[PDB]
Ligand binder design. Structure first.
Ligand SMILES: Cn1cnc(-c2ccc(OC3CCN(C(=O)Cc4ccc(OC(F)(F)F)cc4)CC3)c(C(N)=O)c2)c1
Length: 284
C-alpha cells in the first residue's frame, strides 16, 4: 500500500473520538469502500459544541486492514494545512472503525466546476453564472498552495485531479483523496510507474486545464489507449477558450517532457497568486 509514504514519520499522536460524540445524519453521495456520512461531532472543538464532520467507516477487519487503517490515520494527522482536507481523528470503540474529516459543504471541485460552468444548464434540467477569471484563478492558487505544502513534506499524491479536491464554506478549495489516472499522468509515470514531485506538477497542469474547461474530461475526444498514445507521443492538451495565454504558459511549464525541466510548484503558486491578484487582460 503506502510503501511510497514509508519515509514520512509523524511526530504527533492520533486523536481518538468517542462513539457517543458521533451522530450520523445521512450519507454524503455514494461512498465507495466506506461510504461517507455527514455527522454531528460532540466535544471535538471547544468553540463549537456540536460541529459538522464527514465520517468514513472502514469495511473490513483483519490485521491487514486494521494495520493499514492505523498507518493511514498516522499520516493524515501529519497532513495539516488550509488547503488539505483536515483529518480530526479515529474511533476504535467497537465496529466499524471510523475516520473523522472536516465537512466541505460544496462537495468535490469537479461537480462544482461543472455546475458553475457554461454547460451547467446542459448538466442540469436537474436543479436549474460562470465562475469568472479571478474566481478560477483563486481555485487554481488554492490547489497549488496545497501542492507547495505536500512537496515540503516530500509527499507524492499520485492522484491529483479536481475529483479529489473539495469545495467548502465560501469557495475554499482543499486537496483530498477519494481513493489508474492515466489522463493526469506524465509519460514516465505511465511507462515506468515513477511518481515524484515532478509527476504531481504535471497532474497540477492537467488540474489547471480541468479548471479552465470547467470540469471537462482531459483528452475527452480519446479512449484510454488513444490518451496514453498522445501523452507518450508528446501531444499537449489544447488551450481552453476560458484560458488566457499567461495561464496556458504555466500548464506548458508543468508539461515539460523532462521532469527536471518542469516548473517548481513554488514558482507555479507564486505566478498563480500574482495573476489571481491581478487577472491578466484577456479577451475571447
Ligand atoms: C455536497 N457533497 C457531497 N458529497 C460531499 C462529500 C463527500 C465526501 C466527503 O468526505 C471524504 C472526501 C474524500 N476524503 C479525503 O479527501 C480524505 C483525505 C484527506 C487528505 C488527504 O491527503 C492528501 F494529501 F491527499 F490531501 C487524503 C485523503 C475522505 C472524506 C466530504 C467532506 N470532506 O466533507 C464531502 C459533499
Amino acid at each position: 500500500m503506502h510503501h511510497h509514504h514509508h519515509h514520512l514519520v509523524p511526530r504527533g499522536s492520533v486523536h481518538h473520538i468517542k462513539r457517543r460524540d458521533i451522530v450520523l445524519k445521512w450519507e454524503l453521495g455514494e461512498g465507495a469502500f466506506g461510504k461517507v456520512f455527514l455527522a454531528e461531532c460532540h466535544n471535538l472543538l471547544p468553540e463549537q459544541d456540536k460541529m459538522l464532520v464527514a465520517v468514513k467507516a472502514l469495511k473490513e477487519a483483519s490485521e491487514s486492514a486494521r494495520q493499514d487503517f492505523q498507518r493511514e490515520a498516522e499520516l493524515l494527522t501529519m497532513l495539516q494545512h488550509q488547503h488539505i482536507v483536515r483529518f480530526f481523528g479515529v474511533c476504535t470503540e467497537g465496529r466499524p472503525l471510523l475516520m473523522v474529516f472536516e465537512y466541505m459543504r460544496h462537495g468535490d471541485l469537479n461537480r462544482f466546476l461543472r455546475s458553475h460552468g457554461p454547460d451547467a444548464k446542459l448538466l442540469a434540467g436537474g436543479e436549474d453564472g460562470p465562475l469568472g477569471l479571478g474566481q478560477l484563478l483563486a481555485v487554481a492558487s488554492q490547489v497549488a498552495a496545497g501542492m507547495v505544502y505536500l512537496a515540503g513534506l516530500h509527499f507524492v499524491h499520485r492522484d491529483l485531479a479536481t475529483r479529489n479536491c473539495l469545495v467548502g464554506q465560501g469557495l475554499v478549495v482543499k486537496i483530498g483523496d477519494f481513493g489508474l489516472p492515466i489522463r493526469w499522468m506524465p509519460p514516465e509515470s505511465i511507462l515506468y510507474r515513477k511518481f515524484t514531485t515532478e509527476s504531481d506538477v504535471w497532474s497540477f497542469g492537467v488540474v489547471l486545464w480541468e479548471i479552465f474547461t470547467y470540469g471537462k474530461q482531459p483528452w475527452y475526444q480519446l479512449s484510454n489507449t488513444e490518451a496514453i498514445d498522445c501523452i507518450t507521443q508528446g501531444r499537449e492538451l489544447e488551450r481552453p477558450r476560458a484560458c488566457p495565454p499567461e495561464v496556458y504558459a504555466i500548464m506548458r511549464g508543468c508539461w515539460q517532457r523532462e521532469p527536471q525541466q518542469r516548473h517548481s510548484i513554488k514558482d507555479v503558486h507564486a505566478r498563480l497568486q500574482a495573476l489571481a491578484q491581478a487577472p491578466p487582460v484577456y479577451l475571447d
